[PDB]
């Protein structure tokens, strides 16, 4: 799409407030994303993949540490992502710790 209408949807997804409600939040999002719209690191999806390994080693959910490789193979096989490194970097940065009692649907 086009980024200026697209960032507004991110302000509408996270906040419960519409775009006709608040305008400071959109300006803070434009403050960060505008002028930091270029990746300041170059892509290596391997390094971030081997830290999702170490997170599932950390949780002793190491049956799912081998499930993750099938999730990582698929992403390369479709190739409809501009960067397969970027979204992994996003999901690891937004991580938490759901330790104690696994659940997976695998596909």
């Amino acid at each position: 799409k086009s980024p200026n209408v697209l960032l507004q949807n991110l302000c509408c997804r996270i906040l419960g407030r519409s775009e006709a409600d608040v305008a400071q939040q959109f300006q803070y999002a434009v403050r960060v994303i505008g002028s930091n719209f270029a990746p300041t690191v170059e892509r290596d999806e391997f390094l971030v993949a081997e830290k999702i390994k170490k997170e599932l080693i950390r949780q002793r959910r190491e049956a799912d540490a081998a499930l993750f490789s099938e999730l990582h193979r698929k992403l390369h096989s479709q190739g409809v992502l501009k960067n397969k490194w970027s979204i992994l970097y996003l999901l690891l940065s937004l991580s938490e710790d759901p330790r104690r009692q696994p659940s997976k649907v695998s596909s």
Partner: protein, 65 residues
């Protein structure tokens, strides 16, 4: 055509695999927010910035809303 339907099939596939990756790491994203971020990655975006934005807005909707 045919390759105009293959690309939509592939995006429905990749969003479902990325949803599994988002839920096993216990992130705040769901199927609707994840599509916004993938569309952002099509234009090219620094994810170091995007995650700090989302880290702020979730705290600015549990302190303002």
């Amino acid at each position: 055509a045919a390759a105009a339907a293959a690309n939509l099939n592939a995006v429905r596939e990749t969003m479902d695999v990325l949803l599994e990756i988002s839920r096993i790491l216990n992130t705040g994203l769901d199927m609707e927010t994840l599509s916004i971020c993938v569309r952002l990655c099509e234009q090219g975006i620094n994810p170091e910035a995007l995650s700090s934005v989302i880290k702020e807005l979730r705290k600015a909707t549990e302190a303002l809303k």
